[PDB]
Amino acid sequence: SMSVKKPKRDDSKDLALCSMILTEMETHEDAWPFLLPVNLKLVPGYKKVIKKPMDFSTIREKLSSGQYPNLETFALDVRLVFDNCETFNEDDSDIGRAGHNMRKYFEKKWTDTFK
Template identity: 40%
Template structure:
């Protein structure tokens, strides 16, 4: 759900004074508090009509300077049908520096073949009720010796950044970082703590999700 609310303008950075909301809203362990700032001058219920009016005003201004809205008859050269030409024969295209390779690059997928499934898995992990200790990096100010003990820190937000940067070429690369999150937690925290228990629950959930993907069945850990 966090990813959905981010798209709607919500953020995890809470700037609203705690005394305004603390004790008035349901705040439970494992939940993620999010905030959406709203501008008093904006009438959100009239947003659709307002945007339509703005669009009409912008288009009216454009028409005052542009002739693009005028419709012309097709050129006489098209009378006998359209013939294929080399785009580079058009001076403006040639001057722009365009090349056929650019079209080929534009058609290539933005992310690797595993991106969508890994993103879905990561979102499932982030939204799990045991994910709360692992959503962001451990705060050095809160846990002074953490980075003395844990030499390879990892968290779900860092994994999200790496996924968007296409640093996970294979599912194995993703799982390696996920296991690092859980192993680090168990290394630093006693097994009886809520943190270690959350790591065990979230790791178990991760393997359940992986097991549900047939082409990833070989990734299951040996028992």
């Protein structure tokens, strides 16, 4: 509350560490469905159904331009990519399986780096 603060957690390396995580997601072999924005002209249903599209290239540009206020807003966008994928793709499809694998990979790196 006013003039009463918990001890200051060091956040000075968060930007660099989120960039390292994002590089590791970019270079994973199962990243291919997620590297670029879904083409809304060419994929029927996507525009109406997925209210907030997100992809790794869009996260990279937001990261690089100071559009994440803290490390939690960065994790929310990464998770959005996988939540969108599960909304639109069957579990038993190449893209459906890719999304599950990448979400697993991300959540471990996240815990090991920050928790």
